Each structure stands twice: as structure tokens, then as C-alpha cells.
Write a protein that binds this ligand. Structure first.
Ligand SMILES: CCCC(=O)CC(=O)N[C@H]1CCOC1=O
Ligand SMILES: CCCC(=O)CC(=O)N[C@H]1CCOC1=O
Lengths: 164, 161
């Protein structure tokens, strides 16, 4: 269920420390399990009103990047054909995200053996587009590993907390 | 929905795809092993391991008792075969038999997909120098993980129904 505010604070802490090495960016680490679909865990520096609105309306159920990630193992851009396709069918999430300047970005995806899907979603925000996309592309293997090691760390911390 | 990964022409093309890329990290032994976690009896194996070892491993379903496969099942991050999680599993029959093929030192990279598959990329220096090998894997582990991801992504697209 991943409700432990204290572990999630160390995870957010672990991500922010390492993710700033690829630039000053917005990120969201979002973890969902099929057994608790309306309570995804979100660990992010996105604007809080957007996060709250996203949680309150269960927007992960209609979010083109999350719907695409279900079918992926490899990272993808939000202007990839698969996301554009889903956007044409339901555009609500991107239309509302535009207010908070969440427009262009990338999603990294991970499935585990506990029925979780984990995503690391990254956006520049309002900043200039080209240098961001080119930094993400040159560093995509490293960012994938950060998602992998964040998720391992998270599962590890929840494992120790449950033992004690 | 995904089909069984059993077209010989496709698997040989994917073998060439892996082999050309993984040789950037040294002269090494590799096995790409994909296993369905619901029905795990008959995994797909694309490998340059010694053919007699591969044949023996398939005939005896050794993945079911292989410490690195049993470890990968509960992992998302790569691990060395001397890591504490693997030594715990070490039934040691698989490693004892593998030693006769110089397959002693190695790493496993793992990937769970959304079709109940677990894909692993297992790599070993065989009889070549273990120090150079370990250093090359340690500094290239992010690229090797991405090689597994892109290989599996290709397989998923090729076998999609
Ligand atoms: C609030 C966290 C939302 C996510 O973690 C997924 C995500 O980043 N979706 C993007 C797509 C466009 O607007 C978003 O928020
Ligand atoms: C024949 C392919 C076997 C594998 O793909 C898994 C693997 O590499 N297991 C290692 C562990 C020690 O001996 C092995 O063969």
C-alpha cells in the first residue's frame, strides 16, 4: 500500500539528491498496484495542487503516459506516437496539466514481481525544451538505473520496517 | 497479448543483436533467458554458453533450481553471483555443474514485464580475467541493463499477436 510517510520521505529524499544531476527538473515517482488501484503512491516535486487534484480525481486511470507505460519496458517521450495516440482519445489530463506547465517529458517504467508498476516521470516544466530532451536522451540509461535503485530501496525500506 | 518466443529465424536475429552489442563490454559468455512466471517450465534461452551445458540445463529444467534465477525472481536491480542473496540459495548442483564449463563468476540483470515474463541477461567471464570483467561490468551496468530492456522490447514487438 506504501502509506508510510516517513519512508516515502526518505525515498523522495533519495530521488531529489540524485535526479538534480540531470538538471533542474520536475519529477514524479508513481507506484501503483493492481490490488489498490485507487491509491497510487506519488512521490514528486510537481506543484502540490496538481498532485492533489491528480490524486483526488484518480487521473492515473486516464493519463496517456501511465496507460502507455502499462505496455512498455523501455523509456519513452511524451511526444512518442503511442502517447499522442492515447491523447487523441482522452486529452483531459494533459489539458489540465498545461496550467502547471507539465507539457513535455519522459516516462521510465519498471514492473516488479509484487504486482507493482513503478514509473519515473520527468518534465522540464516551462524551461527551454531542446537542451532538456538532449540531456535526458544522453542520460537515459542512468535515469533508468535511478528508477531501478530507488524502487529497490523503497521495497527494501518497507521490508525492514515490516520485519521490525 | 504475446506469443511464444519460438521462431528460430527471429531468435537468431536477436542473438546477433545481443552478441554484437554485448561484445563492447569484453569477450564474455552471455545468456538471455526469458521465463513465464505463471508457466515457467520451458524458458526461452538465447546464449553463447557452451552448447552441451545449454542442452543439459534445458533437459534437466535447471532454471527451477538455479540460484541466480531464483534470486532474480524477487529482484529488479542487477546482482553479482557472489552477492549475499545468491549464496543463500547456493542447492549448489547448478553451480557445481557449471564449473566444469568455466562458468563460475558472473552477474545477472533482470526485467519483469507486464505479461508475467521475467527476462534475465546473465553474463560471465568464463575462463578470461575476472578482474577486468568485474570492473567492466561495474562501470557499464547501466548500459547493460538498457541492453536487456531494448532486447526484450524487441522480442515483445516481434512476438506480439
Ligand atoms: C502527479 C503525478 C502524475 C504522474 O506521476 C504521471 C505524470 O507525470 N503524468 C503527466 C502527463 C501530463 O501531466 C502529468 O502530470
Ligand atoms: C544455460 C543458461 C543458464 C542461464 O541463463 C542462467 C545462468 O546463467 N545461470 C548460471 C549460474 C551459474 O551457472 C549458470 O549457468
Amino acid at each position: 500500500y506504501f502509506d508510510n510517510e516517513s519512508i516515502n520521505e526518505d525515498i523522495k529524499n533519495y530521488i531529489q539528491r540524485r535526479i538534480k544531476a540531470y538538471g533542474d527538473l520536475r519529477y514524479s515517482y508513481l507506484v501503483m498496484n493492481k490490488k489498490t488501484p485507487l491509491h497510487p503512491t506519488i512521490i514528486s516535486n510537481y506543484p502540490l495542487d496538481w498532485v492533489k487534484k491528480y490524486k483526488k480525481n484518480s487521473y492515473h486511470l486516464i493519463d496517456p503516459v501511465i496507460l502507455t507505460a502499462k505496455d512498455k519496458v523501455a523509456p519513452f517521450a511524451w511526444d512518442d506516437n503511442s502517447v499522442i495516440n492515447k491523447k487523441s482519445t482522452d486529452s483531459a489530463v494533459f489539458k489540465l496539466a498545461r496550467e502547471y506547465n507539465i507539457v513535455n517529458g519522459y516516462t521510465f517504467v519498471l514492473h516488479d514481481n509484487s504486482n507493482n508498476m513503478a514509473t519515473l516521470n520527468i518534465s522540464n516544466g516551462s524551461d527551454d525544451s531542446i537542451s532538456f530532451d538532449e540531456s535526458i536522451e544522453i542520460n537515459k540509461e542512468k535515469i533508468q538505473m535511478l528508477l531501478i535503485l530507488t524502487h529497490e530501496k523503497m521495497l527494501g525500506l518497507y521490508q525492514s520496517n515490516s520485519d521490525k
